[PDB]
Amino acid sequence: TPAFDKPKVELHVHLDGAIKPETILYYGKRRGIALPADTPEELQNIIGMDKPLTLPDFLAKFDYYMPAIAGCRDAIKRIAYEFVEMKAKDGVVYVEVRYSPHLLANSKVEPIPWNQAEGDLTPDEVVSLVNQGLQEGERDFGVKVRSILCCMRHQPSWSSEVVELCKKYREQTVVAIDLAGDETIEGSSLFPGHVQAYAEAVKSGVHRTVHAGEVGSANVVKEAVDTLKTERLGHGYHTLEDTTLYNRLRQENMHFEICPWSSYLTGAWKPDTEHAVIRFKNDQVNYSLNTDDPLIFKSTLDTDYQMTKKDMGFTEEEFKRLNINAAKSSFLPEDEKKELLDLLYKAYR
Ligand SMILES: C[C@H](O)[C@@H](CCc1cccc(Cl)c1Cl)n1cnc(C(N)=O)c1
Ligand SMILES: [Zn+2]
Structure with a gap:
């Protein structure tokens, strides 16, 4: 079956949407709470x-x-x-x-x-x-x-x-802050609780990603860049609907945390449209392929690779590029990011 059985990198995936059913049933029973079913x-x-x-x-x-x-x-x-x-x-x-x-x-x-x-x-x-x-x-x-x-x-x-x-527990194992949840709460990126949090992340070199553009508009992506100052975006699809913002983020080599399966599932992406990743691919974007939530989406990483392989012409070589990029776009420290890259350069040859 496997679509790229080469090593990968992955930047975008939720722990709480990456549990095994049976670990849930286990603490379910173990801890008297009722789950709505009794086989994993x-x-x-x-x-x-x-x-x-x-x-x-x-x-x-x-x-x-x-x-x-x-x-x-x-x-x-x-x-x-x-x-x-x-x-x-x-x-x-x-x-x-x-x-x-x-x-x-x-x-x-x-x-x-x-x-x-x-x-x-x-x-x-x-x-x-x-x-x-x-x-x-x-x-x-x-x-x-x-x-x-x-x-x-x-x-x-x-x-x-x-x-x-994040600062308390830095590389031991935390590397960054994120923004997640209902991106369609109005005003939410600018809520001063968040601004100050990102600003502080800047004060003290903590890396930044933000969910934007998956559902909310291009406005939400540019508040992410300009006001929360992210290095990376999670999703960022709606970025397309503002040519100048797309342009400038292509030019800045911004990282896009792409979740292809996830987006069909969610609605974010609809299928009589051009899937946003194909565009990215055509345009030589910096993006990674990611799974979001294996639990909810009934998926594994290879799910993601399958759709773009199988549905969107993705060649192995894009695969390669996309992983190199994501490695490149890690929140790892510099020295250890080079070492990731040496690992992949060698595995990819
Ligand atoms: C981010 C955290 O790591 C959880 C939060 C899930 C959650 C719970 C309460 C309120 C809201 Cl709006 C959400 Cl999204 N998480 C897991 N999957 C997602 C997703 N795809 O949005 C978010
Ligand atoms: Zn996510």
Whole structure:
């Protein structure tokens, strides 16, 4: 089957949408919460998607399965570990894994995510546990792993704990801040909780990505560049609808975090249209191919490669380019990014 069985890099993927059904059923039963089914399989199909789906019909998914894990130290670390193992199985050599620490917390967070009753697991201890699991992960399956903490659109009261958390735990394993959630909250990029968070990220060399352009307009991408100052964008499709902004980001060699399967699934991309990635490819963009959420999208990395191979003419050589780029566009430190590149230059020949 495999579409490029060469090593890859991956920059854009959510931990909380990368759990095994059966680890969820496990803490489900283990921790008396009821999941809406009782085989890992009924579950998949259920948190699984095979059509677009409304912002809420899509967020409710986080309630089928997140109260199994959040709260639970052992669970959190377990998911971090088995994410890594998951990525070894796709043939990846470097992954940047992203999440919100508040969304696995049950203490020292307002408001309490997912109906949790208040407990003791805080947003700081989530980071440690995620680290513990990601590092031990790395050691066992030999994948390189960094993490990325997400800010939430709708909750810029979190944002500075986020940067702070990012600086606290830097390369041990965190590399950057993100912006995620409902990109269609109006004004949201400029919410001063977020601006100051990114600004602070700039004060103290923390790398930046932001979700934009997947659903919200080209305006949201340019607030991402100009005001939050990102180095990378997650998605950035709608970038096309402003020629000058596309132009200048092509010229700046901005990184595009592309999630092709994800976008058909979500609705973001519709199929009587030109898929945005093909454009990128035609235009020699800096972009990577990424999976977003293996859980929700019923996917693996090779899913993504299949569609562009099989649907969009992607040749192996683009594959190569795109991985080289993503490596190039890692939030790794300089010295260790060169070493990623040596690894891929050699594997690609
Ligand atoms: C970013 C974090 O790493 C979680 C957050 C999921 C979530 C939960 C509550 C409220 C909102 Cl709006 C969202 Cl998107 N995450 C997981 N998958 C996505 C996605 N594709 O948007 C976001
Ligand atoms: Zn994402």
